[PDB]
Write a protein that binds this ligand. Sequence first.
Ligand SMILES: *[C@@H]1O[C@H](CO)[C@@H](O)[C@H](O)[C@H]1NC(C)=O
Lengths: 903, 642, 193
Amino acid sequence: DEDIIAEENIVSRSEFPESWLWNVEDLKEPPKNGISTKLMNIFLKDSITTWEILAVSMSDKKGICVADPFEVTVMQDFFIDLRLPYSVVRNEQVEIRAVLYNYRQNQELKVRVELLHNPAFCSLATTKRRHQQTVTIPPKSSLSVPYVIVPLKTGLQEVEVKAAVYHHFISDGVRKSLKVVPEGIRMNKTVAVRTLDPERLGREGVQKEDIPPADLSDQVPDTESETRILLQGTPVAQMTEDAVDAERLKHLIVTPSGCGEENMIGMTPTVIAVHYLDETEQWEKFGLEKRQGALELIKKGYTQQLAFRQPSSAFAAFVKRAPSTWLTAYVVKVFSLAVNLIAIDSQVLCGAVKWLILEKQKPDGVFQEDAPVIHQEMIGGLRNNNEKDMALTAFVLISLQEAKDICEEQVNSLPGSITKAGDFLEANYMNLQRSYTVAIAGYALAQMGRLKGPLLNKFLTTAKDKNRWEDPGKQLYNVEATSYALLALLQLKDFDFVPPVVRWLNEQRYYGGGYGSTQATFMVFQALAQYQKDAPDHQELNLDVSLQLPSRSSKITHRIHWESASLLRSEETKENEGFTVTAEGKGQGTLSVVTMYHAKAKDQLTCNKFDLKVTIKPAPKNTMILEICTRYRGDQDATMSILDISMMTGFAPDTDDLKQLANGVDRYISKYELDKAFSDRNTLIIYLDKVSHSEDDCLAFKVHQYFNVELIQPGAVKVYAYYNLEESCTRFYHPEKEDGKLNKLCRDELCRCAEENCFIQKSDDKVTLEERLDKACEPGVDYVYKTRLVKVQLSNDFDEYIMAIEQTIKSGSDEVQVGQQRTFISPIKCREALKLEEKKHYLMWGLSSDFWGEKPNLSYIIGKDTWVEHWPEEDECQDEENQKQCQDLGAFTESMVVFGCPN
Amino acid sequence: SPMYSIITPNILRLESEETMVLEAHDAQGDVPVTVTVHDFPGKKLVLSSEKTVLTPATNHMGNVTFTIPANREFKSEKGRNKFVTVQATFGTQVVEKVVLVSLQSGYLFIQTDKTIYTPGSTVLYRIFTVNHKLLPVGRTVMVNIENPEGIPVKQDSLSSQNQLGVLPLSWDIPELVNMGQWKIRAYYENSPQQVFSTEFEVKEYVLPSFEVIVEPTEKFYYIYNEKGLEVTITARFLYGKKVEGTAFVIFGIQDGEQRISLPESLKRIPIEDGSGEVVLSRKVLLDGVQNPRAEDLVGKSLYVSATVILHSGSDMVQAERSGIPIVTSPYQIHFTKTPKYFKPGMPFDLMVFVTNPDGSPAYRVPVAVQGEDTVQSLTQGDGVAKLSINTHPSQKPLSITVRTKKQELSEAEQATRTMQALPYSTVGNSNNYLHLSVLRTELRPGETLNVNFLLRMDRAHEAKIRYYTYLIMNKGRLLKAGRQVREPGQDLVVLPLSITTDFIPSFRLVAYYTLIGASGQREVVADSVWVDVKDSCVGSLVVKSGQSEDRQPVPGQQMTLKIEGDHGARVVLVAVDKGVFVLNKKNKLTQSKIWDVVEKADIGCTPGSGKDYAGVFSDAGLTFTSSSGQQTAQRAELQCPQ
Amino acid sequence: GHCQAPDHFLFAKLKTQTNASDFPIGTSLKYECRPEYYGRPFSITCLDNLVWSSPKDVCKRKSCKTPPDPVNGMVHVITDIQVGSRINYSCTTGHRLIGHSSAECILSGNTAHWSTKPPICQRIPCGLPPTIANGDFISTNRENFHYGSVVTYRCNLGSRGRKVFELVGEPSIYCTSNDDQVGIWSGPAPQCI
Ligand SMILES: *[C@@H]1O[C@H](CO)[C@@H](O)[C@H](O)[C@H]1NC(C)=O
């Protein structure tokens, strides 16, 4: 044009990030009055907007600080705002908008605006021709320029528009991106659910699983898919019997007093109460201040007990009384358990043990009581048995084995005495008549691991109902014996037998702490503590899972443990493929495989709630009449609605006709557009109060063409509800184009743009022989045929010419033999320029990109590079005006057939 | 009878520096002290490592600073609570207390670059790893990313070591993705129980051309106002220029989580110079709902949805103001800053917090307690007003009713609330109390604060009090410990207290004196108070313009940026288009949120005082133990009672 | 009569015959902006005062586009984006640069396009963690490791479970780099014995 910057010289603004300046900076500046100051020279991006800057500081002294936001307003005097949606559907015709803003106070700008040509889009801008308008923008205003385009190839494409003003330095451009989504909808297809139990469901403890590819029958070609695999471990907890409520154990705290016997009777419940509450961790409901007090009581009991310790290291009731074997053994048994609690002198303990062995042990390995204890209620079930040799031998032996680890490396005669007594217990075991003795000697032998075979069977079969070891007599003996038996089971690690026993003990509701409750209390709480200590609360979980994907030679490894049970394993693959899962180890897993893809489902595209019919008709310069009829789909009439109307280029509504609508009831048009100039209204919005759901509500107005130009763009009509823009309907209108649709050629799911020239530029300039020869010898040119038009099949859109090929000059990638018919497709509107009629002959040539469908069934398309030249009939060659043409045709034909090209 | 006492924080934390207060009362010579920490129960010898010597001229008081090492966490999600045994020996005498343990290592904060993302884009996020002192620490941190359904789709384990407490991170949102609210979860390796989280939205969107902001004339609605709800619509371009267009506006009533639209409230208004007005009439409001009584609508909210459409018709932007309360009164009264216990015969200081229906603090609002005349007060900037009342010696609970005294309201529109306080119980009814009075408000670092110690007791034993022991608790730890001296006959003494940046956001001041009371009986009397400090950064961070103000910068032009901060610190930056925040302004990182998270993590559960000395200590988040047997109760609970 | 040879602007070019020194009154000469610059085509005329006309601001110099903020990277720009200017790229921490660090503002003479392409800074990868006997490491990630990833060791408990051996020597370790290269482990500490 006149005095204007060229389009090619304009570099459009491409950068529109939503976030940036992710920079990291340290302040090294020496402080002036405690404040360091760094200056940052940065680069503002292309976007016109206010940028908000948030900073966070981290210091090794002052810590973390979140600064207040800082705004920078980025703007120009004249600029383009290109408004594009998030995503557009492939092959569907849409209308985008470019809004030019001129904010200059007193100055109006004469503007040239141009849309660039992209192969990915079908527009009025061709390869050799631009689409450009010239519009005037008043000071402090804006102007919207509609563009109608059809997306072609999927993926992320680019839309670029440029603009420059006349007689000024002002210019601008916008280059954005847009996602082209194919037809369909996201659908989640669940592939496989596989339960993993390599122990139960696996062979050789190993379970391998085969997972096939997803169905994806209705998947859209070339679209992506994502397969997601989840490994979920399942925790299996075993019920552990209820621990004894600490509310019942409150009475077991007792201040130790009295002489050598009573002191132990009082020390007993306080010692075992700690032991149990420590393992059961019930102190919280018991209270934490009580423990140390109890520890003081224990220390007291021990200290007082040391006053009854004789020079022989043996213990007896009174210092004047002969030493008691059982009492000393029980003192050992208690102090052995008290090591975890209070400080205890190993010399006193191992000394008592040593005295026991070197004094009270008989040559047959039997321990004997020379001086019986005074309290016969503190010995428990040792009474009435008559088996007391065995019973006492067991008791003492147990007391010896509890003190072993402390006294083993001190007293040399300990293991000797242990095995010595053990032989004696072993030999006489099978003759036991009373369950109590079976239990105590049972536990006695179990610590040596010497309870095996027949003896163990005798121990197990003694239990009534496989729960309780009991004899006829007082209950406490049966409880104590059952406790001993529990210690025995736990020593031999038989957990199958255990739970019915513990269920019975707790069922007795015996918390101990009464007259002669010493043995019962101590042993039942020792046993019930060892139970909870050794009781598994879970089933072992170790999972070794491996994944073999045909797309990855790399081996995928995942290990699931019992602490991992909460954690979920996730793996993803973009390729749909069958894969193998190799699982091993204990535990129960769950495997889920689910794919997400694109479905071939149709249509998915429609005007949801709105029916819209647009009719543009010539009125009886040029004046026409645009009529819009609409009806809402629903049970009620819609609320306030919007009619967004664009204009065919060079058109404007009749300013007079608008007022009758605007002043009419139920219709509203803003005064902004009503008092606006006749020129520069290409966009008019009619606000409707309602649209009927029963019958069509229609309206019409006249449109004048103030500017005559070639190839005008169809106008658009968009109806929508104010609360929802997503639900709408879009219609186009053109006088010479059907339904406002642009010419585009589509078969299957693919479409190509028809908006270019129908064929090669016609003569003149008159074509010579060298021209045809050189042009047809171009490496790109594929086929050259001499043809005859058989029959013209017209349609609503595309014309199909049936051409029988009479000879093949040049052959392309298509295999076609002489005499075979072919079909040529041309856009309507090019039919009168082609002026093709039947029975006449023509010469055609084209490229390899013009084929319709796939080999070897093809249809030909006439493009801008397609050559069509009428071949005169033989009788018509005699005419004086056909001479040069016929000579050229024959020449070209035989030159091409016989000699071919030199290149 | 020399008495040995230990003061510790109520709850102990792992891998955090804790302090312990050692005291020897009425002793002679230099007393050595050894401090040991063990597992409960049994002996693991967690930290024996702190040894110190209490001496005269130090007035027999000393610090012990230890950091407890972490077993990490074996079990479990269920718990349960773990305790440790703190034991201290002075030369002979043993004093021990078992303390509850929280597994919290420190705080974690997550910053995302935007508030909303698109499928096929990248989410940039930083993780700030700090301790309880909010100082930077390198540690191991577990990170998870949860989809709307809750399934973590990505989990890693990272180390912030040598990163200076900042972990830069990124995640690529897939192209085939579930739309909704996505969540970034993170926690320390040693503490899976404490999880910090952030949200971000995935949606199909485009950045708009302009923004819409709707505002009511007032932030509530008065039920009897005939004018109805008045709403002003403002619509401005991103570059600050006003707009010309047409707006659609409609109202609605929100009750519970259920919303009900008002069909006849629909209005179409023109937008001129980036402004517009619309009014919801009381008639339409009361007609929309058939409930005939108007007063039923109180306690409900209103919402306005405005949709602005350009005159080009190309761009359309919607905005909403929700939670507009329908109230009988502009104000409400809250006691959450006032202690629930009083010292009989001593001045009781109430702090009344008056707020607007939106939660914003009211400014300059007259309040009083019936009854009547002598007391009156105006609400300050923080929205809190002080009312101090005299106290009767009686044991009857103090029932206080506070009302707003603002003029022009009909008393129907006056806000009222009733509280009750309970008498502090003393030892053996000795009637010996202690009153801590701190008056000044709007306190800032660098200021000094006079603390008034008022002693109440018979003058027979008054000469035996030569000191008060004071403790400054902050951020769940012990900030300071000290001794305020008292000469015989001094009933009210003053302690100057320097205020550093270490008192932010706020602090607690506890104080106690002990003496041998009637007939060889040891009495320990204590009191506490809570002081709010102005919320701010410890240091300073400013980002401003580096050039003179001439005109706006043009796209593509360079800009010099000025940053003002502390020496040696590391600064992380982000720049966001404001069109983004039009769509989502939620979950943005703010210092206020940080201090909020800290103030929610406080172990002190009460504004001050207590039912007794043990109550005073425990409520203020402290434990007091003595060789004479006087000690606090046991808190087994991790959270604050409610 | 007659205006002398016109002054040399040198940022604009005349392509047409200048065979003469003394030009007459009212004669338009066409000055097009030099290829190093860009501006609208204009024409200068004699004032009739023997002096040539003054151009308004028709012509301007050029620049090469907008430098993008790359993913996980910092762009240091000194001076301006004008032709012949240099800008630099730096990955701050935990990433290696693939590309050319120094970038140059260019003139190909038809149009300007950056000489080097924006580099990519990628997270520092690490090899397999050091393997020790009798014990294993636990993590959700095993096969593929990236910079900053921390792994923790443990000792195998067998089946029933028992305390076997002892965990010793700093079980937790992470990937790091003391140079910009493939990452190496902080230390090969752990043992189960
Ligand atoms: C403990 O003593 C140190 C000096 O050794 C002092 O810096 C610190 O402030 C004291 N701690 C408290 C809580 O007073």
